[PDB]
Structure 1
């Protein structure tokens, strides 16, 4: 058994009439659901337009994500890896992005180093090992852009990432302005 958090998917854009039962009825087509629920307003009991489905195994979760697009109750919904309550606190933790910031990479880090660790998550579109525009010095971080936002999500939910022999920190890439707006 893997952690509950890694076996759970967030399902956004739920139709106004989607219920625990209709949600379950759709996603069970890809595996055993150990949990399924539509978040509602504790007051009006009105649906908040989002929910969560949790499979018995991450393998089933991967099958579901490979089954996109998902149309539930006549509405195309938006499934995403479930981000923990703790991480949902960080700026832009719920953004749909295809690029990741990789910080703490050794000076002698080359692109092949990044590929040997990251390709396992999805198709890589661009790899950028950052250097100072002027001195040519290596700055110790890179940007890796994927073909699918789910690749990035599968990555940021894990804790450790080993590149060029040592762990590195991976975050969703925030724009220059999003960086400022967060600072």
Structure 2
């Protein structure tokens, strides 16, 4: 259950778990499907959660299923977001596209770009440089276009890079 691998859905209250399963299984390994219902009336509240094995699967499902219709009888389109674990119910895409990496100090900006462009569209790319010596601090930032690309980078690149999403201090 890696971070950012659970999605939150706003769906029709007549949408069962089976529809969600058959429509979201192609994106990856589903570990849980939870349509929120009233504990006393057992009636769906029109919200759902789907848990994937990898954050890239959840991000792709969110990017490809947001705005779709889950049934001709089910009327209005659904909304899909990345569910946040901490105490709105959704993460913002700005918090999902930029990764922080540890690079060898010999990496130029072009080295980082060539090593990380294989995971998606690099929107911005920079390396933290020691102002005094003018040399790299061994730290880099890569902001992609889609959250799925950042997740693919995080879970596919070498473990020496210690790739992780950027986050406030």
TM-score interval, smaller chain? 0.5 to 0.7
Relative to the length of structure 2, the TM-score reads 0.64
Aligned residue for 2:101?
102
Matched, 1:76 2:111: no
Q: Is the 8 A contact 2:9 2:48 kept in 1?
A: yes
Q: How many residues align?
A: 152
State the shift of 1:75 in Å: 3.3
Q: 1:121 aligns with which of 111, 119, 131?
A: 119
Relative to total residues, which structure has the larger strand share, 1 or 2?
Answer: 1
Q: Distance in 2 between matches of 1:98 and 1:32?
A: 20
Aligned residue for 2:24?
27
Q: Distance in 2 between matches of 1:33 and 1:27?
A: 9
RMSD value, Cα: 4.0
Q: Distance in 1 between matches of 2:29 and 2:163?
A: 30
Q: Is the 8 A contact 1:98 1:152 kept in 2?
A: yes
Aligned CA distance change for structure 1 residues 107 and 77 (closer, same or farther; 3 Å): same
State the shift of 1:114 in Å: 2.0
Q: Distance in 1 between matches of 2:27 and 2:98?
A: 30
Q: Distance in 2 between matches of 1:42 and 1:13?
A: 17
Task: Report the secondary structure of 2:148's partner residue.
Answer: helix
Structure 2 regions of 5+ residues with no counterpart?
Answer: none
Relative to the length of structure 1, the TM-score reads 0.60
Task: Report the secondary structure of 1:129's partner residue.
Answer: strand
Aligned residue for 2:142?
144
Task: Report the secondary structure of 1:136's partner residue.
Answer: coil
Aligned residue for 2:152?
154
Structure 1 regions of 5+ residues with no counterpart?
Answer: none
